[PDB]
Amino acid sequence: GSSGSSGNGADVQVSNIDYRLSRKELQQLLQEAFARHGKVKSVELSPHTDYQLKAVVQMENLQDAIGAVNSLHRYKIGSKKILVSLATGASGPSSG
């Protein structure tokens, strides 16, 4: 019964994560970087156990993510450069 956020929140799609590094050593490092920008909400990891190891860094504030993405973009991590990218669902923030 795990359903990603819907309506409010920020989802940062992370790709090209150095699988070589342990999941505990990553989820911690990633959260650290994003934290330097804003406030890290949560850190999720993909079930992939290979070079195709992705993840999703949840951020408290939306804006915080915007920059955090263009900033952490290609963040020299572990032994591979992580590619940050925002995420969009079906229903937008409906902000007018």
Q: Provide the H-helix boundaries in the chain.
A: 23-37, 62-72
Q: Which structural domains are found in the chain, ordered by start? A: 8-87 (3.30.70.330)
CA angle 25, 44, 56 (to 5 degrees): 105
Q: How far apart are the first and last CA of the chain?
A: 32
SS3 (DSSP) at 96: coil
Residue 22, both tokens: 């342990």
**DSSP assigned state of 84:** E
> How far lies 95's CA from each of 4, 8, 31, 53, 58, in Å?
20, 10, 28, 34, 20
Residue 29 and residue 43 in contact, taking contact as beta carbons nearer than 8 Å: no
The partner residues of 15 in beta bridges, in order of sequence, read 83
The residues facing 40 across adjacent strands are 59
Closest among 43, 53, 33 to 12, alpha carbons compared: 43
Q: What is the dihedral of CA 62, 33, 80, 24, to 10 degrees?
A: -100
Identify whether the C-beta of residue 34 lies closer than 8 Å to the C-beta of residue 12: yes
The residue type of 57 is V
Asked whether 79 and 16 are in contact (CB, 8 A), the reply is no
